[PDB]
Each structure stands twice: as structure tokens, then as C-alpha cells.
């Protein structure tokens, strides 16, 4: 269709304003081609010319499916812009029109509507909730209502999955509770599909849903997806592991019962790998996830011990991206505040002291508080054993004292005060 290549906006207005349906189609296609060029589509020039209302209008032309598709694609690309550009589409009444197109007999047109609705809901809470109020969920879910997902076109299924994930996205406020319940069963089904992109996006959706109040985590865990998530956690593809780890990590921020679900699922066996993972970010979120587990019950802190994960924490505390090291500090402080004397002793035997002292030289008052704090916990445990002195030496040996004393003259009241106490109570 070489005729509709690189038209001027004024020519496009000319064709759309003509009273010829075919002319309108050619002009709409040309607009779509401008909006689809590899670099900088003239989204604002198109909006300024007042073309949105026309395009939205062509969405309803059941008798001319070709113009439905062209305007649907044009509107989609406009909607992929800034909030203001996305708003211009919503303002034109595109939401209900796109929902009606979801039932189109033409797969490519229905898919376009799915894409567009995905861009609209992806702008944030307000438009997401507006899409939901217009009743987009039923039609969307109905498109996946087939015996076997594998008979659906791959590109088509990735699109639906992605759009559903956006309906599950954002937090202030979180998606409507009944909307999440409606979507979850399908999300669970997509989580078992064989396509890597479907899996990744499904995990992201589950990660958005588990990112909030423990009641939200509950409705997700209630579906029994933790085992599948743990499995996806051991996936070869980084794009699947990242979202899986996020979901698992969010779940352990909940109650001890919910945390126990991932432990029972066998998640801890994967961490030796995650804690030494080549990507700093997988390594950081893994340590963060570990920190919320050591913040659990002692029987849970023991499972962390039994899987031999303390040594991995010592390693991350010893050498890692600083952010990860900071998450390691927390994991340790949590372990020491809730652990038994035996578990805290074990932590020391694994060699946690030296790497913990070296991190006292970090320019970050918060981590410094967290560390010093952990030290206090450990001494406290050594006191109940009359071995407070053996601990002091050890801290001296590696140069911990020569740093706790220096912090004693820090400018943060939390720090120096915490320092003083230690020195004047243990050194």
C-alpha cells in the first residue's frame, strides 16, 4: 500500500474530512504509518489536528473492518505516549469503543483493542480503574476461555497476558478487590503455559498483586501458586526468574504463615544459586528476600540454617554490590534479634564478625545503625554464655573495636550513642 507512505498531516486531515469512506480508510492508514515509523511519531501533530474523535468513530464501523483496524492501531500508538496523549484518547471515548471491539470476528482487530486497552490501563490507577468500570475484564477473560491456550496464536496470547498484567498493576490505590479475584484464576492458568514471555508477564502480574497489605498476599497464596512460583524461580531465563523472585520476595513480607508457604514449597534450595547469581539485581532481591525470612520465627530461621544459607549470607556480606551488602546487614540484624542463642552462636562460627566489621566503614548511617545493632544482639547472646570476652577479642582481632570507637564520635545520635554503650559495656 505504497500510496499511504509518509503523508503530511494536512493530507491526512483532507482524506478523513472527505465524505468518501475509502478515502478515509487510505488517510487513516497513512496516519497509522506515521505513528508507526521507527523514530518519533508525530503524536501531538495528529492530536492537534483533531483526529482522535474521527478515529474513535471509525472503531464502530462494523461494516468496514479495515478502517476499524487502522484507527485502532493509530489510537493504540497515540495511547502509548505520555499521560496527556493517553488522556486525549480516553477523552475521545475510545475506552468503550475498544471494549466493543474485543468481540470482533477478526482476531487482528480484537488483538489491537487488547493492546490499546493495555496502553490505557498502563497509564496508572485512574485509567486502569476506568477500563475496569467500562467492563473490560469479562470480554478480555472470555478471549482466553479455550480448552488449551496453545491453540491461540502466540503473539495474541502474549498481548492478552501483558494487558491483564497492567490491569493488575499499580498501587495507589491497588486494583479493585473483586477485579483481582475475577482475574486471578486465569492468571493462574497463564502461569502454567509454556511460552517464556507469557510466564514472565504472568509472574509480574502476580508480583504486582503480592506487593501490598498482607490481605492482598493472602488472596494470591490462597490460589496455591507458590509451588509454581518456586519452580519458575529455578528457571534458566533471567526474564522469568526476576519476576518470580519479586513475587516470592513480596510474599515473605507477609505473615509467618505465608512465609512458611514458600519454605514448604522448597524455595530455600534455590538460594545458594540466587545468592551467587551473576546479576547484581537478582542477588540483591535474593538477599532482601532472605532478610524477611530471617525476620521470621526461629523454626524458620533454622530452615535457613539447615539449607546451609548462613555461609552464603557471609559471602554476600563479604563481597557484593553495596546495595546487596546492605540487604545482607538487615538479614543478619533480623537473624540476631529473633534467633536462639545457639543460632546466633552458629552465625558467629560461620565467620559473620569480620565482614560485618568491615561494613562499618560504609558512608551510610542507616546500615551503620543496623550493623552496630546486630553487634549488640550478638554480645547479648554471648552474655548469656559468659563469653562476652571471647567476642570482644575477635572484634579486636579484625579491627572492629578500632571502628566502633571511631563511630562513637559520629554525628548521628543513634550511632555514637549506640557506639558508646558498646565500648563502655564491652570494651
Amino acid at each position: 500500500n505504497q500510496g499511504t507512505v509518509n503523508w503530511s498531516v494536512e493530507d491526512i486531515v483532507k482524506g478523513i474530512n472527505s465524505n468518501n469512506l475509502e478515502s478515509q480508510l487510505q488517510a487513516t492508514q497513512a496516519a497509522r504509518k506515521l505513528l508507526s515509523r521507527e523514530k518519533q511519531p508525530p503524536i501531538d501533530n495528529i492530536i492537534r489536528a483533531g483526529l482522535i474523535p474521527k478515529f474513535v468513530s471509525f472503531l464502530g464501523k462494523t461494516d468496514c473492518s479495515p478502517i476499524q483496524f487502522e484507527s485502532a492501531w493509530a489510537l493504540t500508538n497515540i495511547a502509548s505516549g505520555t499521560s496527556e496523549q493517553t488522556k486525549a484518547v480516553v477523552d475521545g471515548g475510545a475506552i468503550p469503543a475498544f471494549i466493543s471491539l474485543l468481540a470482533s470476528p477478526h482476531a487482528h482487530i480484537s488483538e489491537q483493542a487488547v493492546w490499546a486497552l493495555g496502553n490505557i490501563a498502563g497509564d496508572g490507577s485512574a485509567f486502569r480503574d476506568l477500563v475496569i468500570k467500562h467492563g473490560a475484564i469479562d470480554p478480555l477473560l472470555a478471549l482466553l476461555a479455550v480448552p488449551d491456550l496453545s491453540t491461540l496464536a502466540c503473539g495474541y496470547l502474549r498481548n492478552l497476558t501483558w494487558t491483564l498484567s497492567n490491569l493488575c498493576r499499580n498501587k495507589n490505590p491497588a486494583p479493585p478487590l473483586d477485579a483481582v479475584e475475577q482475574i486471578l484464576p486465569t492468571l493462574v492458568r497463564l502461569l502454567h503455559h509454556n511460552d517464556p514471555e507469557v510466564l514472565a508477564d504472568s509472574c509480574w502480574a502476580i508480583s504486582y498483586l503480592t506487593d501490598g497489605p498482607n490481605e492482598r498476599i493472602e488472596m494470591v497464596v490462597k490460589k496455591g501458586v507458590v509451588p509454581q512460583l518456586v519452580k519458575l524461580l529455578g528457571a534458566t531465563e533471567l526474564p522469568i526468574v526476576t519476576p518470580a523472585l519479586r513475587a516470592i520476595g513480596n510474599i515473605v513480607t507477609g505473615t509467618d504463615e505465608q512465609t512458611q508457604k514458600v519454605i514448604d514449597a522448597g524455595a530455600l534450595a534455590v538460594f545458594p544459586s540466587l545468592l551467587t547469581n551473576p546479576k547484581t539485581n537478582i542477588q540483591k532481591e535474593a538477599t532482601w528476600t532472605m532478610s524477611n525470612i530471617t525476620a521470621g520465627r526461629q523454626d524458620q530461621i533454622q530452615q535457613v540454617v539447615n539449607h546451609g544459607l548462613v555461609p552464603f549470607l557471609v559471602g554476600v556480606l563479604s563481597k557484593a554490590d553495596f546495595k546487596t551488602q546492605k540487604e545482607a546487614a538487615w538479614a543478619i540484624t533480623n537473624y540476631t534479634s529473633g534467633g536462639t542463642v545457639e543460632q546466633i552462636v552458629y552465625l558467629v562460627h560461620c565467620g559473620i564478625i569480620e565482614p560485618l566489621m568491615n561494613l562499618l566503614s560504609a558512608k551510610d548511617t542507616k546500615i551503620i545503625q543496623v550493623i552496630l545493632d546486630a553487634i549488640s544482639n550478638i554480645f547479648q547472646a554471648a552474655e548469656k554464655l559468659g563469653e562476652t570476652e571471647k567476642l570482644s577479642i575477635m572484634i579486636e582481632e579484625c579491627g572492629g573495636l578500632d571502628k566502633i570507637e571511631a563511630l562513637q564520635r559520629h554525628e548521628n545520635e543513634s550511632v555514637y550513642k549506640a557506639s558508646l554503650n558498646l565500648i563502655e559495656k564491652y570494651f
Binding site: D211, T253, W288, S291, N292, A295, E327, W330, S337, G338
Partner: peptide
């Protein structure tokens, strides 16, 4: 507070 949600 020991459990710190996406407060990482």
C-alpha cells in the same frame, strides 16, 4: 516491623 515490604 522487621519484615520490610517493598521497602528495599
Amino acid at each position: 516491623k522487621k519484615k520490610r515490604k517493598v521497602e528495599y
